[PDB]
Amino acid sequence: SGAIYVGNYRVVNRHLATHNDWANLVWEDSSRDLLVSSTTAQGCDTIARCDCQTGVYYCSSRRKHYPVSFSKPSLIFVEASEYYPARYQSHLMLAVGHSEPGDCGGILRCQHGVVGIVSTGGNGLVGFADVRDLLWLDEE
């Protein structure tokens, strides 16, 4: 589990969104496994605006924050899970590291701020949904 709180927005994995998130939906994209909902209170997170390929992510199944190198956001084939059939997931970044389904929502961060959240994994690779291209998260 996990979310990003920036301005009056809440960014979560689309497969873990709650009924309140869907009722207060701002934007969602199934191919990215992301959903953004509106909030009443202001968040404190800063979204990175950069092309970094190094950072640190939180892995709940190890209670550890791991420094990693990661790929640039791309369209990658992802095997079936309990939440989606096998399909191409867009805006996905991979790193060599440990992850389990319940690690979804763990934040990847660089020196500039939040880069993305854990979404996929397997074979010793962890996949993160990028949010750096969602420029509108910084305004209004």
Ligand SMILES: Cc1nn(C)c2cc(C(=O)NCCc3cocn3)ccc12
């Ligand atoms: C080993 C592993 N690490 N991680 C973080 C996983 C995540 C899943 C998973 O169910 N994700 C749901 C969202 C989703 C995107 O694409 C398909 N399904 C499955 C296996 C792993």
Ligand SMILES: [Zn+2]
């Ligand atoms: Zn950065």
